[PDB]
Every structure is written in C-alpha cells, then in structure tokens.
C-alpha cells in the first residue's frame, strides 16, 4: 500500500509520459521559435545536477542510490509536461491565437516549474532533503522561484490539500526569510529601482525599470503575509484596531525606509519589534515576553526566530531591538499619517 501522497501522485501521472503530449507539441510548433529542444535541454541539465547531488553525501545529507533519484526525476518530468500543457492551453495569448515564443522561452519559468515538480515528488515521499534543498542544488533564486508555486497550485487540481499546504509553506518560507538573504536577487531588483521600496498602498491596489512587476508582486505577497500574521497576534493579544494600524504603519516604515534591516533576517522579527515599540509609545503597552508567547503559537514560529537573531554574532530578539531596531525606528515611532491595513 502506498501512502496517500504517493498514491495521489500516481493518480496524477497515470497514463502520461515524461515527454510532451501531442497537444503541447502542436502549441510548441505554432511558435515562431519552437521551445521543445531548449526545454528538453533544461530538463536534461536539471536532471543531471539533481542526480549528482542526490547520490553524493554532504555530511548533513547521506547520499542515496541512483535508481531512486531517476525514479524521482522521471515522476517530476511527467508532472512538468502535464502542468506546462495545462498552463499553455489556458494562456491568454493561446486563446487569442497569438505567438507564444517569448512566453515559452523564459528559462526561469521552466527551471522553476521543474524544481517545483521535484519538490512535489520529494515531499510526497517524505524526503529528508528539505526545502530549500532542491533550489540550492539547482541554483534557483528564491525571489524568482516562489512565483511558480501559485501557478502550480492553479494549474493542477489533482494536488492534495497536504501538497498545497506544503507549497504554501515553502512560499511563506521564501517570503519571510529566504528572499531577504544578502545574496538574493531581491536586492538587485530594488537596486535598478533606485532602492525605492513599494509601499503597501501602492501594491495592494491595481518604459518601466525591469523587475518593477516582480517587485510589486513580491511585496504584495509580503504585505499580505505580514498582515495575516499581525491580525492573528493582535487577536491573541486582544489589541485595539487603532494600535494595530499603528503597528502596521511602523512595520511598513521599516520595510520601506529601513529595508536593510531585513537583510539576512526574518520578517517576523521586524513585525514583533514593530508591535512592542508601538504598543510602548502609545501606552497600550504589552511586554515582549507576552508578545512572543502569543507569537509562538503561529505555524511558522520556531524558537530560533526570537532566540537567534542576526546582530552584526547573534542574540535574542530583545538584544536586537535594543542595539539595532530602536536607533533606526525611534524617530518615526516617537512621532506617535497611518497606512491602510489589508
């Protein structure tokens, strides 16, 4: 008997090949530039690199037999062409009979889709190779990669609730920490935008610098995620909606006017600091201790988030607040327009 996840996976891929279907091939051939060969090459490159890392031991990850790697890979390739066909068929340009060459020639989409497929398969088998293992192995930037998850969730309805939950979890992981690492492509995108961080109001309502759209979507997801977390905290801490709006305003200020604070840190660290300093200055005060016990009941919350925090060297959240956060945000805080809460 297979586990529910692996049997579900088996149901999704039943009767299908690790090659393009006739329908997909036809779409490929209606393009001025037919992607089919370059797509094969990407899967071949990804497949080889995956097998090399899978079968070799890193001291944190005992290596595993090539026959299992290939079976994992094969399954992910079947999923890839299935989801790609679904995506291409439902595309607007396809429905209007317009050439999809430019759409189909973006390498980052195909790489991300194949990685997400590999992640689906690995998860289904309860692999020890935990995200972000697959995107570090394949050299996929978190800032680019996360965008495919929502496409996958949309384009394959055969995914289980548990599979979708996992995909949402690793998107949250990217949004909260991984895309903020010092070497993330996020910083590049902000850079060509003159380090102008979009405000919540700007992205939560419908010749540009490139990555403008990428910046807008990423921060929309970030603002959306942080608002959900802040709403829960305010509920469990039973705070007025006015302090909530003030806490939100302070948090946005740190994202927009102190974005370097997020580099190599965690989104929730800035959100919890925003909570306390605003509760403090408005005399609605809650202790950081009760702030954090309320925080820890959230799904993403692990001890290291407020216990291990980057200082310059690591310390708990309180030390971060005192030696770093206060100095930067106290001018804005001591000042208590308020931002819209999503």
């Amino acid at each position: 008997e297979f586990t529910q996840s692996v049997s579900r996976l088996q149901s999704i891929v039943a009767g299908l090949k690790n090659a393009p279907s006739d329908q997909l091939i036809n779409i490929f051939e209606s393009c001025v530039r037919n992607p089919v060969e370059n797509i094969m090459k990407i899967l071949k490159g990804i497949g080889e690199t995956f097998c090399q890392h899978y079968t070799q031991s890193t001291d944190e990850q005992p290596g595993s037999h090539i026959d299992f790697a290939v079976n994992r890979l094969k399954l992910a390739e079947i999923l890839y062409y299935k989801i790609l066909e679904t995506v291409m068929v439902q595309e607007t340009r396809r429905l209007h009979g317009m050439d999809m060459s430019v759409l189909l020639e973006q390498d980052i989409f195909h790489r991300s889709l194949m990685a997400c497929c590999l992640e689906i398969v690995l998860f289904a088998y309860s692999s020890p190779r935990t995200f972000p293992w697959i995107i570090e192995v394949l050299n996929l930037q978190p800032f680019y990669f996360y965008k495919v998850i929502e496409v996958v969730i949309r384009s394959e309805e055969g995914l289980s609730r548990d599979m979708v939950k996992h995909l949402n979890s690793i998107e949250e992981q990217i949004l909260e920490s991984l895309a903020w690492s010092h070497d993330s492509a996020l910083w590049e995108a902000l850079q060509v935008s003159a380090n102008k961080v979009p405000t919540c109001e700007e992205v939560i309502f419908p010749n540009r610098p490139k990555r403008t759209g990428s910046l807008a979507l990423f921060y929309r997801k970030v603002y959306h995620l942080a608002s959900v977390r802040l709403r829960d905290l305010c509920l469990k801490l039973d705070v007025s909606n006015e302090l909530r709006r003030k806490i939100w305003t302070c948090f946005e200020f740190t994202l927009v006017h102190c974005p370097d604070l997020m580099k190599d840190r965690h989104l929730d660290q800035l959100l919890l600091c925003a909570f306390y300093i605003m509760a403090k200055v408005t005399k609605e005060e809650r202790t950081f201790q009760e702030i954090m016990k309320s925080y820890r009941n959230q799904p993403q919350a692990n001890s290291h988030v407020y216990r291990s925090v980057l200082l310059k060297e690591r310390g708990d959240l309180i030390k971060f607040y005192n030696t770093i956060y206060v100095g930067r945000v106290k001018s804005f805080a001591l000042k208590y327009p308020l931002s819209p809460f999503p």
Binding site: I277, Q289, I318, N322, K330, L334
Partner: peptide, 9 residues
C-alpha cells in the same frame, strides 16, 4: 525609555 529591560526565557 524606549529600551526593553526584559530578559528571557
């Protein structure tokens, strides 16, 4: 004043 004088756990 705006500093946090609490400690942990």
């Amino acid at each position: 004043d705006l500093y946090c004088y609490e400690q942990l756990n």
